[PDB]
Design a protein around this ligand. Structure first.
Ligand SMILES: Cc1cc2c(cc1N1C(=O)c3cccc4c(CCCO)ccc(c34)C1=O)n(C)c(=O)n2C
Length: 137
């Protein structure tokens, strides 16, 4: 079903986060949301915060239905570090390594992720057609 596909898709993404992204050396700043007590202006500067725990919560709620949607939140971790810390910061260098490891692992599982993403979308569209047909009475 679409539900089994959603589960298989989210399982692969979660393993990318936990086995690859969270394992990047010195990735500790990125495993949780920034604590505003320690960085009081963070959420004034950064409009769309993102971190690896939040990505995992999003995966568990099946927010991501495409490789692109996932990568977009992953890219946000890096973009936010560029904005807050600058390109030359160690924070930014580490965030880039996290993004790179994500791309390399997506590459590795691309065939299966691509077929799941297609199958999920097709099932979703078919359910919507069914609902629209039922609205038409
Ligand atoms: C202080 C800081 C500055 C940052 C930053 C992240 C952090 N920061 C940690 O490094 C950090 C390390 C380890 C544990 C943490 C927990 C644990 C919560 C559950 O027990 C919560 C919050 C933080 C951390 C955290 O806010 N980022 C991404 C930046 O760009 N700056 C400038």
């Amino acid at each position: 079903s679409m539900d089994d596909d959603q589960v298989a898709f989210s399982f692969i993404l979660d393993n990318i986060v936990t086995q690859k992204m969270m394992a990047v050396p010195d990735s500790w700043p990125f495993h949780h949301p920034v604590n505003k007590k320690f960085v009081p202006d963070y959420y004034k500067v950064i409009v769309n915060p993102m971190d690896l725990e939040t990505i995992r919560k999003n995966i568990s709620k099946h927010k991501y239905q495409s490789r692109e949607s996932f990568l977009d939140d992953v890219n946000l971790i890096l973009a936010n570090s560029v904005k807050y810390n600058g390109p030359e910061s160690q924070y930014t260098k580490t965030a880039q390594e996290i993004v790179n490891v994500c791309y390399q692992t997506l590459t590795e599982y691309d065939e299966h992720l691509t077929q799941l993403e297609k199958d999920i979308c097709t099932a979703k569209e078919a359910a919507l057609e069914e609902a629209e047909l039922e609205s038409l009475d």
